[PDB]
């Protein structure tokens, strides 16, 4: 059985940790909701 538990407020935090890149990827989305790479 599944249960929910509050974890926090939804707010933008000024001066948050900035990380991660911005790649442009060719993808396909199948009938089951799974993304795959088209290369």
């Amino acid at each position: 059985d599944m249960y929910i538990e509050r974890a926090g407020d939804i707010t933008w935090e000024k001066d948050a940790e900035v990380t991660g890149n911005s790649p442009r990827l060719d993808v396909a989305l199948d009938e089951s909701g799974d993304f795959s790479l088209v290369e």
Binding site: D1, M2, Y3, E5, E13, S22, R24, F35, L37
Partner: protein, 156 residues
Amino acid sequence: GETTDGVYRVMTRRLLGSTQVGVGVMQEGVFHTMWHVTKGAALRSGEGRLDPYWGDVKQDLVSYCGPWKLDAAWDGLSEVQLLAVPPGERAKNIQTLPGIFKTKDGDIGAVALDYPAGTSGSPILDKCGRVIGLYGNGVVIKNGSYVSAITQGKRE
């Protein structure tokens, strides 16, 4: 049950101890999560029951108690924040500039941040704090890291 707006953990006691299978957003009395997290199953909030209302396996989204409420979209230019809620760890905001998922049916924003599958459902926010989508449905790239779509539903 607790109906206050905010981010929530989705937990289960059907494995060893208490395990976090995902995350979700409570907004306007409606709970929003990714379909792969609950598989459309009913949820408990204290001594209350949340029944599914809308869902779609292809979009990988599900809403509880009412129709999908989140309609903000990534503007295609500005940085965004992943409000990550990892298993056994506190909620933490991570800023990034989204990449793109190019599909035959159009482009979608994507966040190149890698958190375990139990983080699925964590919201992605714009500068005014509006939810532009949920983290957790993506792909594994050449280097083995995860890149997730910014998945947003439709508000009727």
